[model samples]
Target chain A: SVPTWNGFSLYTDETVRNAARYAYDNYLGKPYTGTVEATPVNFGGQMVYRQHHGLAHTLRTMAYAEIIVEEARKAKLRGESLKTFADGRTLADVTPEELRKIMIAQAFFVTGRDDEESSKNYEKYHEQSRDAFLKYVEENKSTLIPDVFKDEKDVKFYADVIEDKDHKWADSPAHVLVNQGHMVDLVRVKQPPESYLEYYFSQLQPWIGSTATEAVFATQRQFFHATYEAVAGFDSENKEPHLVVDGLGRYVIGQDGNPIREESSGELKFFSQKKKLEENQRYMRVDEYLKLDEVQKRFPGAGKKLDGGLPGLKEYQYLQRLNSINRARCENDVDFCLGQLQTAHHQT
Target chain B: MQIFVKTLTGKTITLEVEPSDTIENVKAKIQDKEGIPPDQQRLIFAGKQLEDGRTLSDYNIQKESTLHLVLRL
Candidate 1:
C-alpha cells in the first residue's frame, strides 16, 4: 500500500494502478482520482504529480546531486580533477549554501510538466516555481536546519535557480553539477549516451581528465543504478498483470483527468493494455544496446555492467527500459560523455 | 468477537473470531474471505507483528481492534 521510491519510507506498488494510486496519495494526500496520465487534464491539484514528474524524480534529482557532489569531493585531490569540467571548476568551488540552493531548486524542478499546457505558460512557470519555492521556505526553512546562510541575496538565490531565464546557473559551478544531475535523472526520458557527455565534460573540456572523467562516469553509473531499481515495481512481471497494467486495469483517467474506478471500470470491460505495454517494455530494452559495437566503441566495456557480472544489474535494467516509456527512460550515456574512456578499463 | 483488519489498498477487512483464536486462525479466515493464503499473510497489531502460534488474546486484541494485513512477498 505504501508504494516505494526509497527515501519515502515505503516499498511501492502492485501495478501502475497501485503506482498511480501511490503517487496520488504520496503527492496529493487523496485517493488516486486521475487516469494513467496518457495525456493531461484539468483534474486540478492531482495534476501536479504524474509518471513524468513525481516524488521519485524529485527525490532522485536531489539524490543524484548528492552523489555528484560526493563523487567530485573525492576527485578533488586527484591530479586530473580540476581541469576536467569544461569550465575548469572543482566541487570545492561550490559552497554549502550554493549546494542547498540546488537542493531546494529540485522541488520546483518542472513542478509537474503536466500542470502547464501552453508555451505561454513557460515564463509563467518560472514565477510559479519561484513563488512556490518561496512559500516552501516560509513553511519549511526551519531553524533546525544545520547549515546556516548569510544575506537576503543567498536566500533569494535559491529561488533564482528556479526562476532564471538567462541561464545564470549555467556558469555557476554548483549549477553545472545541478545540470549534470538533472540531466542524468532524465534516464527515464530516453536520452542517448551523448547527453551524458556534455554534463560530464560540459562543452567538451577535453572530455577526459581521467580522474575527473571517472568521477562523472561514476555519477552516471550510479544514476542508472538508482534509476533502474525504481522501474522494478512499475514493470515487475514476476506475478500476473505488469504493475502498470494492473493499475490501469483497475483505474481509468476520464477525459477530465478525474480518476474513475471501483465500478465503472467494469470487470468485463477492463482494458488490460498489457499487449502494448509488454511490447513497449521490449522496445526500451537496452542490454543488447549495452552489448552493441556502437556502445562498446565509445566505452569498450559497455555491456559488462549487466552481463550477469554485477549483482542485480540485469533485473534493474529490465524495468528501466520498461519505464523509459513508462516513467519516460536512462542508461548508455557514460561512454562518449567524457569522450570514450581510452580503454574498456579506462587506463587504470 | 469481531475485529477489523486494515490494508494499505484502502480495504478494512473485518473478521469475526474468538479471543482464543490463534494468529493462524485469523489468517485462515481471511484466506476464506479474501482468498489470500495463510502463509502469505502478515498480520500486524498492537505495535508488533503477529505469529501464527500466538493467540489474539495474548495481545489483548478485543472489540474492534484493527490488525493490519500486509501480504508477504
Candidate 2:
C-alpha cells in the first residue's frame, strides 16, 4: 500500500538544533579569549539528505564514482613502485595481478558483497563502477580543484563529486543508502489475492473492514464518561473546568484507507462537555454554582483567585493538583494539538 | 576560508574560498552555475543570514573553514 501523505511531521526540528549546537561550540564560540558573542539563532531549511529520485539507483552511481575509481588509481600507483610499502609490505611482493585481486577483494569487502556474490554480481558492480567513473569526469569538467588532490585527478575528480553531493555509503549494510524521497508502494510490489481477503481481514482485527471510531479523552488515561471531564484544568482564561489543550479527539478510518470522520474542535468539546454532564454530583454542583461577582474576591485581579469562590477547600486543592498535571501533560504533549485538526492536517 | 555550497536538496558543493568574498559574489557564482536565483537566495552560515556586502571574515570564517551553505526554501 502506498502511504498517501497523511500529513505527519516527517522532519524533526530537534535534529537541526543539535547540529547547530555542535558548530557553535567547536568553531564559532571557541577559545573564549575575548567577549563570547552570542550567535544569532535563525531557522532555515538545511538539507537533511539529498532527495535523489531513486535511493539505490543514485547510491550505486555514487559508489562507483567515489570508491571503485579511486581505489583503481591507488592500485595503479602501488603497481608503479613510486612510494614505499604500506605497513612494511613491499609493492614488489604484490604483483599487478595480485594488486587487482586485492583491490577487487577490498571493493567487495566495502560493498558488503559475499565472495560468491562478488564474482556472480561482478558485471552489475562493474557497470556501476564504470558509470561512477564517467560521472567523476563529468562533475570535474569545470573545476579548479583543491591542492591535496592536485595530482590525483582521477581520485580527486570523483572525490569532488561525492563530497559536493554529500554522498555517503559504507559497505553493503554499512554501505547501504537510505531512499528518502519516495515512499515505498507495497501494492506495487506485492499483490494480495482476493481469495485471501477474508483471512487477512480477520487477522488484522480491531474492526478492520470499517472505520474504528474512537474517543480519545483529553488525558492519556481513559476514564468513565462521568469522571472524564471532572478531572481537568486550564484550557481557557477563567481556569474553569476544561479539557487539557489538544485533548479529547475522535477518529475513524476504513479498511480501504479512507477517513470517515476526523478530529475537530466541535467533537472534542462535545465529548468533554457531554461526558462532564454524565456525573450526577457535578451536574447538580453547577446548578449550585456561585457567581464570582457576588462572592468575596480572594485575589486583587478580576479572575485570579486561590479559592476560586468555591465553598469546599477540597475543590480548590483538586483544581491546583489537576492544574499541575494538566500543565505538565500539555507541555510535554503539545504536538497532540498540532495532530488533531478538522481534517488530519498537521500543524507544521 | 572554504564554504560548502549545499543545495536546498542537500547536495554539498565543497569549494575553498577567500574570506573577502561577498555574499553577492557567492550568489552570482551560484546563479551562473547552479541555476539558483540570486534574489531568492539566502546564504546562511553559522545560524545567520550571510547578509550582502558582509565579508565571510566579518562572520569570523577561519582560514580553510569548511562552512555550510543553506538555501532558503
Candidate 3:
C-alpha cells in the first residue's frame, strides 16, 4: 500500500528512501545502485515533480525524501536505515524522530551554503543600492524631510540621518503611511511597510533625473514585489496576478560569478528552496525548541558545525528564555540575495 | 483506435490504442516516446482533463481524435 500522509497518498517509501540514500552516496562520491528517476512525491495532495536538475535539485530531492520519511515514521512505518559511517554508528541507531530533525538540519545547511554563495556574488549590487539610496536622500533631503516630518521642529532631527544606518521607519509616521497605503494591504500585509513604495521614496527621494537611484530602486522593487507575492502566499491566492509570468524572477550565480536569471514557474519549482528557507527563517515554537534543545544537549555539539550551539541552553527553562533566539534568522537576507541582480534594471 | 496527440510545442504524434486501454496506459506509451513521466502527462480531450484510470471509450476517443498533451513541471 502507498504510504499516506495527512490523507494524501505518497510515493512508495522505497522511492523516497532510495532517493535519500542516493543523495548521501552521490554527495560522498560513493558508488550507489539506486536510480534517481523522475519520481512524484505528493505534497499536500499535489504531485511534486522531482526531476534531476543539478545540485540544488538534488538537495531538494533529498528534502522531499526527508519530509516523506518523517511522515511515514509518524504513521508508524519501519523507516529505512543508512549505511554505517566510519565510526560504525548507522543511521538506524538514531530514533526516527531524531533522524528527521537531522535530515531537516542537513537540508537547511545545504540551502544556507547555496544562499551564502549567492549573497557573496550579489554583495556589490547591494552596496550600490545603498549608495544610490544615500545619494538620492542627500539631493532631496529638503523635500523628503517635510514628507517624513510633520512639524518644522521635527525637521531638525533630519541632520542626524546617518548614511549607513538602518532607517528608523517604525518611529516615522511617514513610513507607516507609505506601507499601509497600498491596496494590497486591504487583504493582508506581506512586506515590511518600510520596504513599500512610499517608504522607498521617503528613504531615498529618487527624482526623475536621478537615474542611478531610480534604476536601483526599480530593480529592487521588481524583485521584492515578485518575491513578496511568491513567499507571502499571494502568488497562490489569485491566479490572475501571476498570469503574466510563471515564476518570480531571481538572479542565481554562475561559475564565473555572473548572475543567471531564473524564473520559478510551474508547481513545486522551488519546493526545496522554499521549504529550506521557510524552516530556516521561522522561529521554533516553545515545545519545538525544547525538543531541539534536548537533542542538542544529548549530542554535545553534534550540529554545532552547521547549526551552531544553543549557548547556555541546557534545560527547557534556559531554552524558554532564549526561545526568541531559537527563531530562525537571515530570511530577509535570503530574500534580498534571491531578488538582487548583477546590474539594476533601469526604469524609464 | 488511432488518436493524434498534439504537444504544447505544436509537435503531433499518432498512436494506435485499444478502446479498453486506460489513459494511464496511453500515458505510458507517450512516456516511452516523449520522455514525459506518466504522472507529469496531462492529457486533455474534449476540453477536459483525461484521468489516468478512465478508458478511452469513456471520453469517446476515436480514430484521428486530436488530444492535447501538456507536460507539466
Candidate 4:
C-alpha cells in the first residue's frame, strides 16, 4: 500500500534514522557507500562529526575550557596552582613551549585517551603554541610594567602580569592593562577562539582549503554546539551553574574516567602550577600543616585554625572540589586535540 | 498484465497479473504472499512514481521488464 506517510521525506524516527544513515553512508563512510546504503551506525558517525565540528561542539568546548582555566586561575590567586603542586616548584618563568604543553596536556587529560602518538602530537602543538605566545609576549613587552616598586625586579613573566600577594603592581595600572592586553594578544595567536577555523575556511577562503572539508568541519562544529545546547538543559539554574549532569556522566563513562562523586581524596588531582606560590606562601610550612591535619581529628588546635584560615589546600583537596570543572576542561582539550589531529590526518 | 515487488531494505520479486488488478489489489496480493501492504507501496517506473490512472500499458511493462514499488514506510 502506498502509505500517505511516505509521500514526502517526513520527520519520523525511521526517516531521521534513515537520513542520519544517509549522511553517514555518503560522508563518513570510508569507502563512500551509495545512497540508502547507509545504516544507523553511519548515522552515529555523523552525529559524532556533527558534535565535534558544529556550533554545539564549539560552545561545549569553550564552556569547558573557560571553567577549567578560570578555576586554575582562581587557584593561582589563592596559591594552589596545579603547576606548582604537580611539580613542587614555582614557574618563575615557563617557556612558551611549556605553557603550550600545559594547555595541550590539560586537553589530553580531559579526552581520556592514552595514545602515545596523540600525546606526542599534543606536546608538539603546545610547543608551537609556546613559541607563538613567546613571540606575542615579546612583541608586546613595552606594555609590561617597569620596576615600579623596590622589591619588584624585572621578571620574565610568561604572559604579562603575575599577580603577587602584596598586589603592589596596582600603581602601574597601565602595566596591568598592557599585561592584560598582552594576554589577549597571546591568546589570539595561541588558540584564536574555536570559530577561527570556520572563519578562515568559509570567509577568508585560504589556499589548500577545500570546501568539502570546510563543510564537513562546519557541520562538525554545529554538532558540538548542539551538544552543548542539549546538555545545558540539565542543572541549568545552579548558583554555581552546574554543567548538564548526564552529558558529563555519559562523557565520563565513554572516556573511562571516575565519575565525580565516587572519587576519593588521594584519587583526585587538581591544582594549577601558577597558584600555589600566591596562597600557601605565608604558611610556616604549608605541606607540614596539611599533613598534620590529615592525621589528627583536626590537627589539635593551632593547625586546625591555620588550615581553616588558609584556603587552597593540597592538590588532592583541590581536585576534590573541582572535579566537574576538570571534566569539562578535559572534554574540550581532548576534542581540540582530536579535531586538529583528525584534520591533519585526513589532509594527508 | 503484471505487478512488481521489491524491498527497499533489499528484497526483489516479480509477479504476472491481469489488467483488472488495481494498485491496491497488487498491494493485497503482495501482502498475502510477501507481507507488504497496499498503503505502504510505491509504483515506480524508472525511479519516478506512476500516476493513479496509469496502467502497465501506460509504461510498456513487457514480460522481461518490471515495475519497481519500494515498500514505503
Candidate 5:
C-alpha cells in the first residue's frame, strides 16, 4: 500500500499534475498525448528506473527545488526565522542568483550507472553521483557552469554541496533541495511491479521477488515524510497514515515474514500499477511521443493556419515553446535511446 | 558606510565603518561581533586581498560592495 499525506502535494497533488500536464501540452506549441518524462545503471549494464528516473524526474525535482527555495527566500525576506530543517542551518542570506545555480546543478546530480559490477549497488550509484560531481564542474566550468555561475567562488560553493558524495542526504541546503526532490520521485518505485519487467529487463531477480526493493521503498516513504515535515509549504501534518490502495496500483505483504508479495489479485502489485498508469495515459514513452518536427509532419496542420472559422490564431499556436524540453528529452534518450534504456556494456 | 561580509557558511554580516577605516580596523570590528582574531582572517574584495596598510577607500570599497572572508585553516 502507498502512503498518503494530509492533502495534495506538488509531489502527489492532482491539481499540480493537471497544471503541469496543461503546460506539458501547451509548452510543445502543439497538441499531444501523455506527459514527457534518469537513472543510474543496473543489471544487463542498463540504467534502472531509466524511464521514471529520466529527464522528467530531474525537471520535476528542479521545479520542486525552485518553489521550495522561493518559500525559504520569502521567509528570510519577510524577517521571519529562516530555519528550514531540524538543524539550525538556514538558507541564510542566499540570494536568488546563488539559488539559481543550485537549481541548475540539478541537471547533473545523476550520471547514471557506471561499471557493470556496481550497477545495482545503491552505495556505488550514489558514490559516483556525489564524487563525479566535481569532475562535471571541472569539465563544464569553461562552458555550462559559467552559463549559470560566472564567479569561480560560487562554482566552488556549488560543488561543496556534492563534494561529500552523498545525496541520501547532505548538510547543504542545496543538497536537501536537490536531493529531496530526487527522492520524491522515488514514489514511482511503489508503482506496480509489472512496469519494471516491461522496461527493466536487466534487473530481473529483484523483479521476481519484492524482498530486495522493500527496504528502499520504505526508505522513500519515510524520507518523503521527513522532508514534508521539515520544509515549509508542504502539508504540516507529518503523521504517517496507514497504507491506502492506489486507484491503479495494488499492495500486498511479502511472504517469509518479509515484505515479499506475489500474484494475488493478478500479477505483481508494482506491475499492476504500471499497467494502470499506462492505461490512463499518465506517461508517454520516448519513442512513442510525437516530437515537434514529427508533429508538423504527422499533423501537417500543427503549424498551419486554422480554418477561417477559428479567428486570430493558427492551427496550434503553441508549437515548440521551449527548446530546452526537446533538447533535454532528446539527449535524455540517447545513451543510445530505445525509447527506454538500451543495453550497452553487459554484466560481469 | 556599511558593507556586507560573506562567509563560507553562507551567512552574511554587515560591518559599520568609515571609508577611511583600515582593513585591520575592519577585522577588529568583526572580532568584536564574531570573536575571530584578525591574524586568522583574510578579507578579499574584487579579487584581491585587502593589505593591512591600505584604507577601505584605498581598495575602492563602497557601500554596495561585499567582501568575501576566508579563514585560514
Candidate 6:
C-alpha cells in the first residue's frame, strides 16, 4: 500500500522525510494552514508560489519531494561521489542526513521557483541560463575540468557540444558528462566509471516520466534563468544576455563602438546589437550575492530592514534593492555600466 | 606620439601614445573603445606580436605607424 498525504503519494523515503523535516524546521517554517501568514515578495509583479489551499500546499510538497528523490537517485545510479559538507563530513559520513537536507532544500527551492509561472519574469527558457552556465563553465573549464577525459580536446569537445543541441534525455551521456562535472563530487570518485566517453553519451530516463508536459521542463529552465538573472540581471523582457556571434558561432565584436550588424546581401549590415550583450561573468545566485560585502555596502538596509522582518521582506524587494543600487552605480560609471550590461543586458 | 590602429575587419582608429606607453596600456585603451578585453587582443606592429611589457620605444614605433589588431580566441 502506498503511503498518501492529502490524496497524494508521499513517496516518503527516509531521506525525503529527513530533507523535508530539516527544511521545515530550519528554512521554510511549518506549512501554513487556515490563512497564509505572509506572502513571498514577488519581484516580477506576479503570484508564483502563494499557497492558498491545502491542495496547493500538498502538490507543492509532493513536487518538492519528487525533485530531491530524483536527484538523489541520479547521483547514486551514476556512482557519483558524495559531496563534502562545509563541516567536512562527506555525504557518506553524515548521520541524520543534514547534508542531504541542504542539497534537497537547494534543489527544492530552486525547482519550486521555476515551476512557478512568474519565473517568466526574467527569462522563461532554459536556453539563456544554460548558456550562462555554459559560459561560466567555459571560462573556468581549464581549472574545473576533471582529468577523466582523454585530453583537453575531449573536454573542449564536450563543453562545445553540451549547449550546441537540446538535451532530449536527462540521462544522455553528453548530459551525464555535464551533470557529473557540475553536480558530482570528484574528490570521492574512487574509481572512474568505465566507458567514460560512452558514458558521456548515455541516454537515460526522464525524471518526471514521459507523460510530464513541456511545462515541467520549461519550468525548470525558466527557474534556471531566474536564478542566474538574479545575479546577471536581465535584458528587457528578461532575456538572457549573450554575445554577438557570426553565423558560424564565432564571437564578433563591432568596430569603433559601432553596433554589431548581421551579414546582409554580401555585406554585414546589422546583427542583433540592441539586444546582443555578451554574458561572460558568472554571477552568484541572489541568496549568495546578498551576503557579499559589496551588496551590503551598496544597499545597507537590505539585510537589516528586510531580512529580520516577519516573513522577511520578500525575495523581490531584495532583488529590487540590488537592482536599484546597481542601476545607480551603472549610471555613474560608464565602464561599470558596460561590464554590467555585458553580464546582464538591459535597455538604456 | 600617435599611431593608426587597424582592425582585421578593416576599421581604423587613431590613438595618441607616449614613448613610455606599454603595449598593454594601448590594449587597455583599445578595450575601452572597442569592447574587447585586453587579454583577448593581439596587437601586431611591424609584423611582430607586441609584448605587454614592451614600450613604444622598444618596438621602435613612431607617429603614423600602423598597428594591426587581431582577436585571439
Q: Between prediction 1 and prediction 6, which has the larger TM-score?
A: 1
Cα lDDT tens digits, model 6, A254-348, are: 44433234554233233332234455422122223233353344322123211110124342333344234343333223234324422321110
Candidate 2 docking band: incorrect
lDDT of 1 at A76: 55
| CAPRI-style docking class of model 5 based on DockQ | incorrect
TM-score winner between 1 and 5, please give it.
1
Top-scoring candidate (lDDT) = 1
Q: What is the TM-score of chain B in candidate 1?
A: 0.95
Looking at model 4 chain A, report the run of 10 residues with the lowest lDDT sum: A230-239
Show what share of the native A-B interface contacts model 3 retains: 0.00
Judging by DockQ, tell me the better candidate of 4 and 6: 6
Name the better of 3 and 6 by DockQ. 3
Q: Which is the winner by TM-score between candidate 3 and candidate 4?
A: 3
lDDT of 2 by residue, B1-73 (tens): 5565632121344455677887788777766665656755666554356788787779876653433344332
Q: Which of the two candidates, 3 or 5, achieves a greater lDDT against the reference? A: 5
TM-score of 6: 0.20
Best candidate, TM-score: 1
lDDT of 1 by residue, A193-262 (tens): 2222322333323323344445555544444434432210111111111112223332233444333335
Which parts of model 1 are misplaced by more than 4 Å?
Answer: A1-48, A81-89, A112-120, A141-147, A191-348, B1-73
Tens-digit lDDT track for model 3 on A36-150? 3324333223332321222222232233323323333333333333223345443223343333323322222221111212334343323432343334334545754444334
Q: RMSD to native for every prediction?
A: 19.7, 29.1, 27.8, 27.6, 30.3, 23.0
Question: What is the C-alpha lDDT profile of model 4 across A129-210, one tens digit per residue?
Answer: 3343344334434542241111223322321232222333322322222222122211111111211222222221221123
Please give the distance, in angstroms, between residue A21's alpha carbon in candidate 6 and its true position after superposition. Answer: 6.1
* Each candidate's DockQ: 0.02, 0.01, 0.03, 0.01, 0.01, 0.02
TM-score of each: 0.43, 0.20, 0.23, 0.20, 0.33, 0.20
For residues B16-65, write the lDDT of model 4, one tens digit per residue. Answer: 77765555666666666666546556666543576655565565554434
lDDT of 2 by residue, A222-256 (tens): 12111111222211122112112123221222343
